[PDB]
Design an enzyme around this catalytic site. Structure first.
Site, PDB file in Angstrom:
ATOM      1  N   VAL A 130     -32.170 -52.619   4.005  1.00 16.89           N
ATOM      2  CA  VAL A 130     -33.611 -52.494   3.846  1.00 16.89           C
ATOM      3  C   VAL A 130     -34.277 -53.375   4.908  1.00 16.89           C
ATOM      4  O   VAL A 130     -33.913 -54.539   5.055  1.00 16.89           O
ATOM      5  CB  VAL A 130     -34.063 -52.936   2.409  1.00 16.89           C
ATOM      6  N   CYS A 131     -35.282 -52.829   5.590  1.00 14.36           N
ATOM      7  CA  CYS A 131     -36.154 -53.595   6.477  1.00 14.36           C
ATOM      8  C   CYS A 131     -35.304 -54.367   7.489  1.00 14.36           C
ATOM      9  O   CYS A 131     -34.406 -53.776   8.111  1.00 14.36           O
ATOM     10  CB  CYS A 131     -37.091 -54.404   5.589  1.00 14.36           C
ATOM     11  N   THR A 132     -35.539 -55.674   7.695  1.00 14.63           N
ATOM     12  CA  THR A 132     -34.797 -56.447   8.680  1.00 14.63           C
ATOM     13  C   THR A 132     -33.346 -56.703   8.278  1.00 14.63           C
ATOM     14  O   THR A 132     -32.598 -57.271   9.088  1.00 14.63           O
ATOM     15  CB  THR A 132     -35.528 -57.738   9.008  1.00 14.63           C
TER      16      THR A 132
END
Lengths: 226, 226
Positions: free
Chosen positions: B99-101
Site C-alpha cells: 500500500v502507498c509507499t
C-alpha cells in the site's frame, strides 16, 4: 486545539474508528483521544489490540465525539457509565457522530429521540424503538448529529468535518495527501445492489445477533420511557 | 488456514494496514499476523499504539504478505533484517502486496526489478532507480505482485484477494456485511483531479521528505547493484 474523541470499547469494529482517526489526526491543531473507562489495552472484534489514552473522568470537553460500531455495541447499550459520558459530551459538542451500529449506542443514550438517523442495514429496524426517524441513506445529518453507514463512513464524513472546522481547501489537501480515491472491485455494498443470494447469506449470518439486539433494544427503550 | 501477514513498523501509516486487516480477518479459515522484530507495542505515525503479534523468526510461511507505507518507510529501506525477511517470505508467497509507499520497501528489497509497479504520487519518481517500470494506475499487478495507491488501497485489493483465494460470492458477502460503498465528498484524491493550488500545497509539504528519500533510495539502489 480542536478536541476529537472516539469511544474505544471491547469488541469494537476497529476500522470504524481507525479510518476517521488517521484522517482527522492529519489536520493541524487537532488532538485526538481514544476514550474508555481507564487508559490501557482494548481488544477489537478481530483480535487487534488498541490502547485507550484517557478515562471518562479525565477526558477534556470534546468538540467532536464519534461512536464506532461493532459486536461490542450490545454491551454498551446497557452500560450506564458509558451512556452518561456520551450524554455529557453531546450536550456541548459541535458534532455528535457515529459509524455503523454506533448509532444504536446514541439511541440507547436517548440522543436519537425525534432525530433522523441511519445504522447498519441488518439492524435498521432497531432505530424506531429508540425514538429515531429511520432514514435509508448512507450519511444522515440532523442538526449537529451525523450518522453514517459502512465500515469506512467515518473516512468520508471526516472530510466533511475538516471542511467545516477549517475550510474546503484544507479538506482537499488532506484527501490528496492520502491519495484517497476508492474504487471497489465489486458492487455488493448495499442490500439493494448485492445479488439476492448474497443478501440471504448475510441476513442468515446476522440473525442470532439481531435477535439478541432486539432484546437489548427493548430494555434500553424501557429506560428511556422512564 | 490461509496465513496473512502485515509488516508493522514504527511510524507506519496505520490505516494502510488496519483497513485490509479488518476485511481479511472477516474471512473464514484465515490467520492474520502483525510482524515486527519482536512482539509488543509499535507506534504509528499518528501516535496510535498497535501491537505486533509475532517476530520475524517465529512467523509461519505466509500465503499473503502486505507491506504498508508511512513516514517510517525510510528507515525500513535500509533495515537489512526486515529486507531479508521480506525476500524470504516473498519467495513462496502466493501474493506479495503493498500500500502507498510500502512499494518503496519492496523496491529496496529488490522485488520490483523488471516489474510494473506504482506508489504514492509524490514519491513516484523513486520507482525507476529501484528497477521498476513505473505505472500511474491505482492498482498494478505483475504476476503475484500487487501494488496499490491510496490510504485505503488495501481495502479494495483485499476484496480481490478474497475472490481469488475463495470465490466471488465470498468477497461479495464480506462487502455487504461491512456495508462498504464509499462516496467521498470531494474529488481531490489524485493530482490530476485536485485544484492546482492544492497540488502545490501538498507538493511543498512533501518536499523535505522527498529530498531525504532520494538520498535513501540511491543508497538502496547501490546495494542492489552489488
Amino acid at each position: 486545539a480542536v478536541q476529537i474523541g472516539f469511544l474505544l470499547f471491547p469488541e469494537v469494529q476497529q476500522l470504524d474508528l481507525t479510518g476517521p482517526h488517521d484522517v482527522l489526526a492529519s489536520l493541524p491543531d487537532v488532538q485526538v483521544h481514544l476514550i474508555w473507562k481507564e487508559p490501557g489495552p482494548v481488544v477489537a472484534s478481530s483480535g487487534l489490540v488498541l490502547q485507550a489514552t484517557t478515562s471518562f473522568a479525565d477526558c477534556p470537553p470534546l468538540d467532536v465525539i464519534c461512536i464506532p460500531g461493532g459486536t461490542g455495541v450490545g454491551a454498551l447499550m446497557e452500560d450506564p457509565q458509558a451512556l452518561a459520558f456520551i450524554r455529557q459530551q453531546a450536550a456541548r459538542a459541535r458534532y455528535v457522530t457515529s459509524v455503523c451500529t454506533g448509532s444504536l449506542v446514541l439511541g440507547a443514550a436517548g440522543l436519537l429521540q425525534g432525530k433522523r438517523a441511519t445504522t447498519h442495514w441488518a439492524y435498521h429496524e432497531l432505530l424506531a424503538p429508540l425514538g429515531a426517524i429511520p432514514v435509508h441513506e448512507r450519511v444522515v445529518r440532523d442538526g449537529n448529529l451525523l450518522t453514517g453507514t459502512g465500515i469506512t463512513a467515518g473516512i468520508d464524513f471526516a472530510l466533511t468535518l475538516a471542511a467545516e472546522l477549517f475550510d474546503a481547501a484544507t479538506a482537499q489537501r488532506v484527501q490528496l495527501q492520502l491519495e484517497y480515491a476508492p474504487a471497489p472491485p465489486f458492487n455488493a455494498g448495499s442490500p439493494d445492489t448485492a445479488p439476492a443470494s448474497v443478501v440471504q447469506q448475510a441476513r442468515q449470518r446476522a440473525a442470532d445477533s439481531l435477535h439478541k439486539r432486539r432484546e437489548i433494544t427493548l430494555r434500553a427503550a424501557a429506560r428511556l420511557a422512564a
